Chains A and B, each alone.
Chain A
Amino acid sequence: VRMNVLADALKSINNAEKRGKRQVLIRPCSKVIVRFLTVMMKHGYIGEFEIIDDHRAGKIVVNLTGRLNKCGVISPRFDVQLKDLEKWQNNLLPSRQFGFIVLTTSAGIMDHEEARRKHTGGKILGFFF
């Protein structure tokens, strides 16, 4: 069944972006999903998103723009040090200018460049550009 809940969320908002919809619906809403979309919120990759808290696992209606190229997800959550993060963005991002690898660390959920300030590392969720 639905093993990875973030994965079926990211590919859902990726298909609607390729087709070109204005706002897509995601069936589950976890803590990891909101901490993912808000990473794309700050970089200006999706429009203003809002969730609906029902008395079950929530749903989300994100707002889309024409900016996102792809928001794929890495599976499973691999261990990522700091001596190999540049060995991950070497083969997972288009170029050194744009594109991000969101990764979870003990500080929280943030992109790969934010972790260079805090010098910390952790598991990897996905990536968008």
Chain B
Amino acid sequence: GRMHAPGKGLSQSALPYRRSVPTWLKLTSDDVKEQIYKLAKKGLTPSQIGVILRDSHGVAQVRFVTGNKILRILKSKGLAPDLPEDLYHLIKKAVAVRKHLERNRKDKDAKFRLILIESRIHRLARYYKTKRVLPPNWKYESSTASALV
């Protein structure tokens, strides 16, 4: 049941029962951790890192080869992005709409779509504030957001 849609879909991953390393995986903890670092220094969100790792090197879950998950490995070293990637891609979507909304101000649907983004941005803000990964003086502002890509 989506939160800004009438769709009640059901489609996501289902992790297998066994929580151990794949028997064909001959990669070590340090080798995996430095593999995440290579994607980290060249720029890649925690989500897309886990993508290219389960397609070329073939890791089931980095939580199972290493005792941590992707973001906790990046925050441990200092390769983590400052503001979270779900809040990043919502902002990247909100500034894309407003730029399109700048030339199409008759497009009343894109105005309705923008409020749904703003509702989901101002929801993730006051969540991350309580988890202290965002400072309490951090407030989203539409005009200044275009810099923060």
Contacts and interface: CB of A to CB of B under 8 A. Distances in A.
Contacts of A54: 17
B1 A55 contact: no
A1 interface: yes
A45 to B, nearest CB: 32
Interface residues of A, number: 3
A15 B142 CA distance: 52
Indicate the size class of the contact surface on chain B.
under 10
A53 to B, nearest CB: 11
Contacts of A55: 15, 17, 19
Interface in A1-32: 1
Nearest to A56: B15
Nearest to B18: A55
Nearest to A1: B1
B13 to A, nearest CB: 13
A55 B61 CA distance: 15
Contacts of B15: 55
A59 to B, nearest CB: 13
Nearest to B15: A55
Contacts of A1: 1
Contacts of B17: 54-55
A90 to B, nearest CB: 40
Interface of B: 1, 15, 17, 19
5 contacts: A1-B1, A54-B17, A55-B15, A55-B17, A55-B19
